[PDB]
Structures are given as C-alpha cells and as structure tokens.
Amino acid sequence: EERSYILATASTGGTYYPVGVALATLTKVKLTPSYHFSLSAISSAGSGENVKLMNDNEAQFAILQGLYGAWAWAGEGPYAERQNQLRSVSMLWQNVEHFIVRSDLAPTGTIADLASMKGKKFSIGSKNSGTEFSGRQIMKGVGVDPDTFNLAYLGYGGSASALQNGTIDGMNTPAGVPVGAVTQAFAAMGNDIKILSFTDEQIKQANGNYNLWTKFDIPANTYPGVDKTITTIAQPNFLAVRTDISEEDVYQLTKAMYENLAFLQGIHKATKDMAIEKAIEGLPMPLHAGAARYYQEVGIKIPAHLMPQ
C-alpha cells in the first residue's frame, strides 16, 4: 500500500525536528491522498546519526548539516569512503556563520583576526556539536589552529552570557538569522563586540576542496544597534534522500515543497529562508534524479557537480 517514508531530524528541542515535522505534514495533507506516499519525522541525535540511519534504511530521508554532507560525499571527516547511498533534495534553511569577538581585538574586522586572538578564551560551541565541528573546519581553512585558543565549550546562551560577563573574548554561534544568542549579546554589549566578516579569499579558504559555504549578507538592522549589512558565510541545512527512493516520489515531494512554501513557513519560520533560486546553493552532494527533474522543469540551471550521479 502506501510508502511510509521515515525522515530523521535531531533533538525535539531544536530546529531540525520542527522543520522535519513541517515537511512530513505537507506530505500527509497534500500528497498522501493522491500520490500514496508520506514522510514521518523522527527525532535523532543529529546529522551523524542521520547518516547511519539512512545507510541502514531505518530512515529514507534526513535533514543534514551541509558540512556532514560534504564529509559524507568526499569520504572525509568521520568517513573513510564516500557515502554513496545519500543524495540531496533541497536547502531548507541557512546556517549563517557568526564569529563574534571583542571589537578591540579585530584589527581588520575579518575572520583572519582570530589569529591575533590565540591564547585567549573563546567558546567554540558545545562539545561534539555540529557547532564545534563547523567552527574547527572554518578555522583550519583560514589557517588558525583552534586548539591554540583557550577553548570553552559553551552552548548558545552560555556563550552569550560569558561574553557579556567578560569571561570569554569571542564565540562561535552559527544558526538561522536572527540568532537569539547574538541578539542577546548585542542588546547587552552594543558595538563593544563585532561579527567578523569574510572576504572573497577567506570564503575560498573556509571551503577548501568543498563547495559548501557561500557569501551571506546579514541585512542591516538584524541585530540591536547593528545598522549596516555584514558579509559573512552560510551553509545549508538540507533535505537528503536515499538513492533508491522512487524518482517519482522525490519529484512530487520537491514540487510540493516549492508550490507550498507558505504552508511550510506557517509551521516553522526557519523555512522562510527557502526560495526556488536558493534551493540548490551550497548543496554538498549531487541531487537525487527526482529533485533535479523538478528544478530543470522550472528553469533552474543545475551546476555540473550537482547533476545526478
């Protein structure tokens, strides 16, 4: 009968889970009666578990952080070989990098200023979180060894409070814009702190061999007292699917997402990031054939490296 697919997300207290629920709901309300498949969201420990669940067919779809997808496709990071059972479908929202430091420690204003801050207290994120891993990945790319800082491993709220109390000099807090912890820090500290920017050369450095982070301009007036645009980088949180899932089902799913963006956005605001012209930006692994069919149908040019394989 009905093909009841499982969609893996992350903890029920974060953003992966409710965005996943929103996709699942879209399929059950708009697709199951006519097309006879559904997605149902399950919680998980996050991207690393999600790759294992997909590989074992306990899940057929998952929300993945871009970097985990890059590692999976390259056979790098925690992987020793390419994870060839995984393909991409769509960006769902953008993880925007926020490397924030005391302003008097930023002689250029750019991410290279982390190097002037060795030996100082810096919160790289929760231990073993996606945030720790993306912070380490970016810093290594711009040539700064994270372990030459005095690293603290604080969450988003803990980092903001430590910055406000003066017990750390910078923090790494990436997420969908606006990031609550960054709002709190600027609200309390104003322009005593600074979001570090990324030049075009630093964007290339952050990516290394990957095509994952792209230029992202934080709009003026996003954060208290920051009345100017800021150029940083962002990577996608994206929907992944097993290669053996029906092309027709993946096509109908991709089409329904882009024909019902307001439906998704009314369930969870993170999907306000979605747009047909941003659908494939920074995806770290090639598209499933069914998703590519939809994108070409509506006139999207797919880069060679994302064409189905």
Length of the chain: 309
Q: Between vectors from CA 60 to CA 72 and to CA 266, what angle results, nearest 5°?
A: 100
User: Would you state the structure tokens that stand for residue 179, as one six-digit string?
Assistant: 């990031």
Under DSSP, is residue 116 helix (H, G, I), strand (E, B) or coil? helix
CATH number for the domain formed by residue range(s) 3-94+237-306: 3.40.190.10
Interacting residues of 239 by C-beta distance below 8 A, sequence separation 6+:
23, 61, 62, 63, 88, 89, 90, 92
Strand partners, 218: 230
In this structure, the number of other CB atoms found within 10 A of the CB of residue 55 comes to 15
Amino acid, single-letter form, for residue 306:
L
Helical H segments across 41-193, by residue range: 47-55, 66-74, 130-141, 156-165, 180-189
Q: Do residues 22 and 15 make contact, with C-beta atoms less than 8 angstroms apart? A: no
Q: Which phi-psi region, left, alpha or beta, contains residue 10 (left: φ > 0; alpha: ψ -120 to 50)?
A: beta
Core vs surface per residue 278-305: b (16+ CB within 10 A) or e: bbbbbbbbbbbbbbbbbbeeeeeebeee
* CA 69/CA 63 separation, integer angstroms: 10
Do 256 and 264 touch, CB atoms closer than 8 A? no
User: At 276, which amino acid appears?
Assistant: I
Neighbours of 245 (CB within 10 A): 20
Please name the residue that has the structure tokens 């439906």. 263
Resolution in A: 1.8
Q: How far apart are the first and last CA of the chain?
A: 29
Amino acid at 220: A
- The 10 Å CB-count burial string (b at 16+, else e) for 64-100 is bbbbbbbbbbbeeeeeeeebebbbbbbbbbbbbbbbb
Q: How far is CA 295 from the centre of its chain?
A: 21
3-state SS class at 192:
helix
Sequence-separated (6 or more) residues with CB below 8 Å from residue 240: 50, 54, 61, 62, 63, 64, 69, 86, 87, 88, 89, 285
- Collapsed DSSP state (helix, strand, coil) of residue 278: helix
Distance CA 90, CA 295 (A): 10
- Among the listed residues 94, 256, 254, 294, the one whose alpha carbon sits nearest the alpha carbon of residue 302: 294
Give the 3-state secondary structure percentages of the chain, helix then strand then coil, rounded to 5: 45, 20, 35
Residues of the chain with CATH 3.40.190.10: 3-94+237-306, 98-197
29's enclosing H/E stretch is none
- Please name which of 85, 60, 29 lies closest in space to residue 257, comparing C-alpha atoms: 29
Residue 298 DSSP SS3 = coil
Strands 121-123 and 150-152: parallel
Count of alpha carbons within 13 angstroms of residue 270, beta-carbon side = 23
| 3-state SS, residue 184 | helix
Cβ atoms of residues 32 and 2 within 8 Å: yes
Q: What is the SS3 assignment for 34?
A: helix
Would you tell me how many other CB atoms lie within 10 Å of the CB of residue 132?
Answer: 18
How many angstroms separate the Cα of 82 from the Cα of each of 79, 111, 266? Answer: 7, 30, 36
Residue 135 amino acid letter:
G
Environment class of 131 (CB within 10 Å of its CB; exposed 0-12, middle 13-18, buried 19+): buried
Retrieve residue 176's tokens.
């969908």
| 58 close to 6: Cβ distance less than 8 angstroms | yes
CB 199 within 8 Å of CB 109: no
- Structure token pair of residue 155: 């969450």
Q: Characterize the bridge pairing of strands 3-8 and 61-65.
A: parallel
Q: How far apart are CA 159 and CA 142, in angstroms?
A: 22
The counts of H helices and E strands in the chain are 11, 11
> What distance in Å separates the CA atoms of residue 42 and residue 236, rounded to the nearest whole number?
20
Helix, coil or strand: residue 259: helix
In the CATH hierarchy, which fold is given to the domain comprising 98-197?
D-Maltodextrin-Binding Protein; domain 2 (3.40.190)
Q: Residue 221, class by beta-carbon neighbours within 10 Å (0-12 exposed, 13-18 middle, 19+ buried)?
A: exposed
